[PDB]
Amino acid sequence: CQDVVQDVPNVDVQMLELYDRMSFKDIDGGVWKQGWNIKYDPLKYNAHHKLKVFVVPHSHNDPGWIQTFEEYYQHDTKHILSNALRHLHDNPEMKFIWAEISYFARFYHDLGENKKLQMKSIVKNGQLEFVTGGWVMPDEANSHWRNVLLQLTEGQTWLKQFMNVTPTASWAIDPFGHSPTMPYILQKSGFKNMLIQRTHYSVKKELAQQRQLEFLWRQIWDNKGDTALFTHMMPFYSYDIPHTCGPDPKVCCQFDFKRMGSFGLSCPWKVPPRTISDQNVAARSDLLVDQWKKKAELYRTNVLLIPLGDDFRFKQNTEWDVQRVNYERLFEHINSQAHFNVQAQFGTLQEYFDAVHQAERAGQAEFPTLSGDFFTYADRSDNYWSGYYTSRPYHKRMDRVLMHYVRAAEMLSAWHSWDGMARIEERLEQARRELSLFQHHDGITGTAKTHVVVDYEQRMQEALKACQMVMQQSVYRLLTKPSIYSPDFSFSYFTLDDSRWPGSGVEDSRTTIILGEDILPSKHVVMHNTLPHWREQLVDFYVSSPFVSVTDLANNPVEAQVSPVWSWHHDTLTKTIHPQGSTTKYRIIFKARVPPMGLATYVLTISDSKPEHTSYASNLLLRKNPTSLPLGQYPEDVKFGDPREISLRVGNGPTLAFSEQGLLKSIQLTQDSPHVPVHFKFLKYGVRSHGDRSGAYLFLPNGPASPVELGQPVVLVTKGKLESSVSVGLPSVVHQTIMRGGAPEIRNLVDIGSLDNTEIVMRLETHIDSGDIFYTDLNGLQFIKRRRLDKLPLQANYYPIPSGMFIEDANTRLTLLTGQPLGGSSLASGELEIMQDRRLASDDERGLGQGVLDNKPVLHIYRLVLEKVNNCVRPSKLHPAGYLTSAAHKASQSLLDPLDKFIFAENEWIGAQGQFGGDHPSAREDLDVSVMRRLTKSSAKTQRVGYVLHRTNLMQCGTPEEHTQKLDVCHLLPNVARCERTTLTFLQNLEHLDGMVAPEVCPMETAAYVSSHS
Ligand SMILES: *[C@H]1O[C@H](CO)[C@@H](O)[C@H](O)[C@H]1NC(C)=O
Ligand SMILES: OC[C@H]1CN[C@@H](O)[C@@H](O)[C@@H]1O
Ligand SMILES: [Zn+2]
């Protein structure tokens, strides 16, 4: 295993280092506005060294954006695909590439057999080529790597099954900025090449000058280079035709033959395309070839890629004809005029890369190595696309909840083979596809129109329901004596209970367990732990009485705590935001201990008075002018007081001190240690009154944020033996700090209401001497070093915070982990900030045609980990990566993959069992079974189960951390006959494993294994 901490990789281009050096000046470079006047030597190409040009026809299809997926399919895409099938069938030399398998599958299943056969034929013969082959072209900023893998697998599995092909070249022309998580996953999924387009215009200029637009992209910690994937970065401002034939859009636009009038399109540079004729072909070719030779100067080989396409192009048969015929006339003339020394033809993306590597193998070019990312993107001037790291935060949070529910549903149902009547495969397929669709670069990004966001939400809601059905059926089967197990595959044996989604104050969705001497004395509940190690976590349930005790299934008492159910209200009468306690229901909380990838059953039993092992939280409402807060049967009366500073300590955990406004002010790790200044503060950014306006994509603040005026907020303190918390009703946010004995959990119920042109940010102020350095993660997979650059505007220093960020000095680190992707930064030494929501009244000129005014209450969650790190073995100053501590990684896991909770839905569960998985190996804490998925239906003689195993890398800070068992996923199910290491999508076997043992993987590595069983 490579050491991913101590050796700084030697690469030709390291993006953080490049950023430190680059000046980013936005100077007018001429017709190539963001470049320079490219010059070339006409003698470079000649009879024995021609410029091979591949014109690659494409059609960018967004699976939802201005219309919903189905609306675009009906109005545009089904015509594009039907006409592509006809045109390619009839014109054997025409080519076309396709990326979005969600649309292709939607089309294909509506085709009759004759057409399906014609389609397989043009794919088999190389005319129609799939690029990437993912369900969508995903966002790369907010997406979790697990969902990027999920959607890639969904599309490639469909392609293998129905088209018998697996793309090895990736095409990503629209994500707003690019992540190295893509080559990481692609290279482990059989890919050999990838192409990207949206990178900062300054970076395109810089790499173009050095002919470094094509590079071997390796991971920031990869010293050896085995993660390397050849990447082609396009050079220009757009993937449209005006910005893909060469440097001058006024000339290239003339070669987009769909812009002549009858299609309602034109060239904004005021020179329209002209039909190619025998009389003008030489002059048109003179112009086109000159553009091509200028573009070729920016690369190292004599093979040139010329994309030919735009949004939803190649729709009408007349469009196919006008593009094809005019280009064929140009090719016939150009390839017969020896003086151009050009051979041009339509080609596919793989054809291009194959020729490039033939040139490379012939010793004609060597490519530079590069590590780093391409965030934050700006397409022009100071227009940085950091707004979408936060836009539509409700759905960004929903993405993470469904991410976890899909994993749990697939894992819980994988243990058994199911009868087709159970509809398990059907429900899981729907769930995987709706989540996969939302990874689209206008889905999770929050950049779609309002009715499209609603469509994604409805689809994810149906996916969550499908997951719940599968999980509850699976739990009943896993924990019921087999000879008693009697399933009704449509029956609800259990109801899932989720404390954080949609969340208290967002939707009243949780069921109350109704107990009573006259109706039901007790209730079984079950917890599932999807992680491959024993895990304890506090869980809560709503109950109809505060006098409830908990036992495990051996009837052993389990210590519990009961707290009231508090809900906050913006009281339009008193004009205060204050809490009301329920008089009909209460929260029971206790520590559940669950086996690795297993289940554990507990029982809640009512009693007539306080039970021996249940304690009751005290509650204190701090506010001027209080009124009573009756709590029905709750045994402790609420206390009141004027606002004041308070301190709390749960267990042996940290002691936290709060200001009289209910916000954290300091953390003291142990009773003897210092009260470290750590202060939460809420601020707001506005929008510019002159010039460019922030919108769904762009963050264009009118200067640094201003503090939210807090008034004298109402603060509620609940103190319990197992859990305490401080909650405060601030304008737009009910802010809560919860303590369970370790790093606190922060929950913000964010309701931006009608505050137009406002972005609400949550900032942490410390005295940590971080200077201009901070760390943020990429897709929940790795942490990358960031350096705040004052030569760049505020919005450029904002980065995606898909799951965590931290600052540190030589001795102290503060890590903030998130349960949802949001945008954030460290704008000054000692600070961290992360945006909660943004409401924008204007459109930002990127095509959406609306601002963001559809905000709704969202419950954001976090873990805040303050740690001493002077004893940790950290990377050197020049290393571009950072790594979490064990506590911060576990904290992240508690937000993203919490225990699942199930309430038995009927009165009596006959045949109930206490635990499942007690014999599963408890793997080392840095290892995770990211995916467990049965790959065969029940009629398959040989069953197959796939596993994706990921090992992160955690800092060695002196904790002995020991004794764990090796996890061999191939032996998790009985009767194993074979164990194979496969690509991450499970589509190709890479290694037959001895003894049918799946070895564990190295730090920062991810492997896939498939076990076969008789
Ligand atoms: C398609 O995949 C390869 C062709 O390169 C080969 O296995 C066979 O011809 C096809 N597979 C099928 C249809 O089973
Ligand atoms: O300007 C951004 C838009 C451009 N390309 C389209 O296909 C959209 O997905 C993008 O959101
Ligand atoms: Zn797009």
From Swiss-Prot:
Residues forming the catalytic site: D174
Location(s), subcellular: Golgi apparatus membrane
Cofactor comment text: Binds 1 zinc ion per subunit.
EC nos: 3.2.1.114
UniProt cofactor(s): Zn(2+)
Cellular compartments per GO CC: endoplasmic reticulum; Golgi membrane; Golgi stack
GO molecular function, one term: mannosyl-oligosaccharide 1,3-1,6-alpha-mannosidase activity
Induction: Inhibited by swainsonine and by copper sulfate.
Main location: Golgi
Membrane-topology annotation of the record: Single-pass type II membrane protein
UniProt pathway annotation: Protein modification; protein glycosylation
Keywords: Disulfide bond, Glycosidase, Golgi apparatus, Hydrolase, Membrane, Metal-binding, Signal-anchor, Transmembrane, Transmembrane helix, Zinc
Entry-linked SMART domains: Alpha-mann_mid
SUPFAM superfamilies per UniProt: Families 57/38 glycoside transferase middle domain (SSF88688), Galactose mutarotase-like (SSF74650), Glycoside hydrolase/deacetylase (SSF88713)
Residues exposed to the Lumenal side: 1-1014
Catalysis: reaction(s): N(4)-{beta-D-GlcNAc-(1->2)-alpha-D-Man-(1->3)-[alpha-D-Man-(1->3)-[alpha-D-Man-(1->6)]-alpha-D-Man-(1->6)]-beta-D-Man-(1->4)-beta-D-GlcNAc-(1->4)-beta-D-GlcNAc}-L-asparaginyl-[protein] + 2 H2O = 2 alpha-D-mannopyranose + an N(4)-{beta-D-GlcNAc-(1->2)-alpha-D-Man-(1->3)-[alpha-D-Man-(1->6)]-beta-D-Man-(1->4)-beta-D-GlcNAc-(1->4)-beta-D-GlcNAc}-L-asparaginyl-[protein]
Gene Ontology biological process terms in this record: encapsulation of foreign target; mannose metabolic process; N-glycan processing; protein glycosylation; rhodopsin biosynthetic process
CDD domains registered for this protein in UniProt: GH38N_AMII_GMII_SfManIII_like (cd10809)
List of residues binding Zn(2+): H60, D62, D174, H441
Family assignment from sequence similarity: Belongs to the glycosyl hydrolase 38 family.
Function in brief: Catalyzes the first committed step in the biosynthesis of complex N-glycans. It controls conversion of high mannose to complex N-glycans; the final hydrolytic step in the N-glycan maturation pathway.
Subunit structure: Homodimer; disulfide-linked.
Protein name from the UniProt record: Alpha-mannosidase 2
Organism name: Drosophila melanogaster
